[PDB]
Design a protein around this ligand. Structure first.
Ligand code: NAG
Ligand code: NAG
Lengths: 123, 121
């Protein structure tokens, strides 16, 4: 299953990066699982993941780091609390969990560049 | 001549970006011209330029948004006043002007990413 996500995103001054992960639905999926994985160096790690009925909001483990909104064959993701060290490749994984059959799609990754604010005088 | 510059650089939250530009060591002390070209395909435009004798300090005198330092066959270019819309490809062009021969070197371009920061109250 084709998953597309932007090649590069810049985090804002507040360390919030947002991007669109959209999937090419092979059928009519009611339940979907989205996962954000961070790749680096040769390893992959799970950042956040929402399992949602398409017709409702997404709820994450922390949800202080990821938020998301579903809107058809796509989902608006937001990653928060980013610092420079978090610069890296963020992979969007999409799973269609219901109805059968299961489909799995993995996108090419979005490079997220993050900068730390410079010092600000007092106070 | 070979000119090396980093592939990607991030501007600070102050809208300042720096990168080193390195050229192939000339056979001798030479007058060197360093030029920053912004590439906005197919737009190519001079952002700033400076000339110095090797062994002297590089110093921009064009009143551009660029300042720089020099050491050996490297120059450290600092460009200030950048905003998000200035995100793009910045090419380091280096010319060995004289004593001859004349040599031209063009780097591969540094992609500079810039964000608009929050002010601080
Ligand atoms: C999701 O992204 C679309 C554009 O792809 C945007 O128009 C829409 O406002 C976004 N939904 C939100 C902000 O929840
Ligand atoms: C390049 O110049 C900037 C601004 O002066 C400085 O912060 C940085 O340390 C310099 N980098 C190198 C490699 O000299």
């Amino acid at each position: 299953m084709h998953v597309a996500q932007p090649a590069v995103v810049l985090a804002s001054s507040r360390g919030i990066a947002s991007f669109v992960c959209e999937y090419a639905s092979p059928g009519k999926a009611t339940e979907v699982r989205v996962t954000v994985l961070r790749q680096a160096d040769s390893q992959v790690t799970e950042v956040c993941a929402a399992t949602y009925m398409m017709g409702n909001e997404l709820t994450f483990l922390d949800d202080s780091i990821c938020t998301g909104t579903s809107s058809g064959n796509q989902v608006n993701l937001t990653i928060q609390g980013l610092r420079a060290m978090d610069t890296g490749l963020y992979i969007c994984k999409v799973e269609l969990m219901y109805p059968p059959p299961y489909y799995l799609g993995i996108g090419n990754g979005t490079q997220i560049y993050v900068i730390d604010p410079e010092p600000c005088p007092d106070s």
